[PDB]
Amino acid sequence: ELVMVEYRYGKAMPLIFVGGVPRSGTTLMRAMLDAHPEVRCGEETRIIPRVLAMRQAWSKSGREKLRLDEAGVTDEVLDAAMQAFILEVIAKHGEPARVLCNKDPFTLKSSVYLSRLFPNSKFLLMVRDGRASVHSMITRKVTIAGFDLSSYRDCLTKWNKAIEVMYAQCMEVGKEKCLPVYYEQLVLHPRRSLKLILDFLGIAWSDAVLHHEDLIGKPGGVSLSKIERSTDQVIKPVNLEALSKWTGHIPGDVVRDMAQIAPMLAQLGYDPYANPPNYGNPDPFVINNTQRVLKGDYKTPAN
């Protein structure tokens, strides 16, 4: 059980994995967890999904898997090495905390596997209206492998397949180990959302999760990468600006076919025929954050 200064980490520890399709509020979610005094998530590691994908490709190739098994590099060996690699990155790339956490969006395509490597780990799958996520990719020019930012239809098709896989993984892991978290409900009702989430995680309530913007860059708080694309959004308090700014910007033929391009919308409970849906009524807390954000209380940082 390797140490950090005095916190011990190991494959049996309670870990939190946060993920989902990029542009779904995954940075906001992990920032609110980072605010909790018992948790550290930190920035996207980038390398954890890369080594997962490679290791999965080794076993999917019949030829490579035979060579590896003949060499004694069995699944048992691959699994022990993946555990060791992932724990070191999670443990070392940020401050120590009692509960460690990782947010790399596409790790949730592998939640079944991760839940076997880490038997007391839990998963938060961020779910956001595919139309809002795709509009974010395209307008912010966020580069994602496989997503052609010149085509709403292609991005929505890829969004649909991505969340289809991650949602199935979530369902296979089961209600005790993976919780779908709806972005729109997180923004409309942050206190109610975090209360359910922390209860699902087995972690005591702390108000700090509702104050993540007080804790940017502070010891025990929210560490941000200046390069990550959500940084200038997450430094503000929870607000409504991004709930449905996609309405009106989707080509008419894609609106027409929305239910066929993205059947996962209705699977997940979204109204694929509304432009936009009424997602709910915001807490006064969030209404007040929103008007302050829109009127200019929060300045763009110089960096």
Ligand X SMILES: Nc1ncnc2c1ncn2[C@@H]1O[C@H](COP(=O)(O)O)[C@@H](OP(=O)(O)O)[C@H]1O
Show binding-site residues for 3'-phosphoadenylyl sulfate. Answer: 23-27, 128, 136, 140, 183, 230-239, 245
76 near its own copies, rule: CB under 8 A: yes
274 near its own copies, rule: CB under 8 A: no
Residue 211 interacts with, from Mn ion, its own copies, ligand X, none (CB under 5-8 Å by kind): Mn ion
Kindly report the CA angle at 48 between 45 and 49, in degrees rounded to 5? Answer: 110
> Is the preceding omega at residue 276 within 30 degrees of 0, hence cis?
yes
> What CA–CA distance (Å, rounded) separates 76 from 287?
52
Catalytic residue, chosen from 44, 76, 176, 241, is: 44
Nearest to 33 by CA among 153, 172, 186: 186
Nearest to 107 by CA among 170, 197, 20, 225: 20
Token pair listed for 36? 């909790």
Work out whether strand 7-9 and strand 15-19 pair parallel, antiparallel, or are unpaired.
unpaired
In the shown chain, the binding pattern of residues 164 to 203 toward its own copies, with x for contact by CB under 8 A and - for none, equals ----------------------------------------
Residue 230 interacts with, from ligand X, its own copies, Mn ion, none (CB under 5-8 Å by kind): ligand X
240 phi-psi bin (left φ>0, alpha ψ -120 to 50, beta other): alpha
Please enumerate, by residue number, every residue annotated as part of a binding site.
Answer: 23-27, 128, 136, 140, 183, 230-239, 245
> What CA–CA distance (Å, rounded) separates 45 from 192?
29
In the shown chain, the binding pattern of residues 202 to 241 toward its own copies, with x for contact by CB under 8 A and - for none, equals ---------------------x-xxxx-------------
Name which of 93 and 292 has its Cβ closer to its own copies.
93
Nearest to 106 by CA among 180, 41, 17: 17
- Count the neighbouring beta carbons within 10 Å of the beta carbon of residue 94: 18
Name which of 73 and 255 has its Cβ closer to its own copies.
73
> What CA–CA distance (Å, rounded) separates 147 from 57?
21
Q: Which stretch binds its own copies (CB under 8 A): 16-24, 49-57, 166-174, 283-291?
A: 49-57
> Is position 44 annotated as part of the catalytic site?
yes
Active site amino acids: 44
Q: Give the interface with its own copies as residue ranges (CB under 8 A).
A: 42-47, 50-51, 54, 58, 64, 66-68, 70-74, 76-78, 80-81, 83-85, 87-89, 92-94, 223, 225-228
